[PDB]
């Protein structure tokens, strides 16, 4: 519960930080 | 065109299987 959960949430934090920074550079190209 | 497109997809597919291989290999060897 302490190692598998917390490592997943950190990688889940890297989801949203990627997908926000992906499309906000995409929609602001032009 | 219908045959020439088919081989060009194979050659690229063989290539970018090699490039994903050693980058996965290099990233392992880079951690040391």
């Amino acid at each position: 519960y302490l190692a598998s959960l917390i490592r997943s949430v950190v990688a889940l934090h890297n989801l949203i930080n990627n997908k926000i920074a992906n499309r906000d550079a995409e929609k602001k190209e032009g | 065109d219908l045959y020439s497109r088919y081989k060009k997809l194979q050659q690229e597919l063989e290539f970018l299987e090699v490039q994903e291989e050693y980058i996965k290999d290099e990233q392992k060897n880079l951690k040391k």
């Binding site: - | 996965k24 990233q27 392992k28 951690k31």
Partner: protein, 199 residues
């Protein structure tokens, strides 16, 4: 179908009944009502209860809108029968055997009661060691029958000094349960494998 149940034939009775059911599987069904249908289904509904297809029993009952409750004792007889198998009511099955609106349903009910007797047997074939002949009358059935000779020759249960002997059906349970040591050591390995190896 009437000839199939009269001649005591198991695979052929369901063979003709399926094609009969395929003919009530008619897509364009104008089809004025052949008055033998409801007891024909009741033959199949009682037969398929008898071979312990209870999951197929209730999924067949979908096709009747109001004949289950309003009328039609031919279909009302197995579903009242199956209701009696539910709660605790073994004996009402064996008492309401002697009431059939149709022909006697004899090739269905004798296999039907025999697959009730082994459940009473499989309850009483446990490691609970000894009972007497009056428990055979209560639990199994039948004050002095040929059936006590039947279970004497088929099974044990021999009447000794006014006592039946049922042997211990008890298991031995050889357990260590640390013997999941290889598979538990295996189970740890794919943990660290799936953490690593994708680099």
């Amino acid at each position: 179908a009437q000839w199939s149940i009269l001649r005591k034939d198991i695979p052929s009775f369901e063979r003709y009944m399926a094609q009969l059911k395929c003919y009530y599987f008619d897509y364009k069904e104008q089809l004025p009502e052949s008055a033998y249908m409801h007891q024909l289904l009741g033959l199949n509904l009682l037969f398929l209860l008898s071979q312990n297809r209870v999951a197929e029993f209730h999924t067949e009952l979908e096709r009747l809108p109001a004949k289950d409750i309003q009328t039609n004792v031919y279909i009302k007889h197995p579903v009242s029968l199956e209701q009696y198998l539910m709660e605790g009511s073994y004996n009402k099955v064996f008492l309401a055997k002697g009431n059939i609106p149709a022909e006697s349903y004899t090739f269905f009910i004798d296999i039907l009661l025999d697959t009730i007797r082994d459940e009473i047997a499989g309850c009483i074939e446990k490691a609970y060691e000894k009972i007497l002949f009056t428990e055979a009358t209560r639990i199994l059935f039948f004050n002095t029958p040929k059936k006590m000779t039947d279970y004497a020759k088929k099974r044990g249960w021999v009447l000794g000094p006014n006592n039946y002997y049922s042997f211990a059906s008890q298991q031995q349970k050889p357990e260590d349960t640390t013997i999941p040591s290889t598979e538990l050591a295996k189970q740890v390995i794919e943990y660290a494998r799936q953490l690593e190896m994708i680099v």
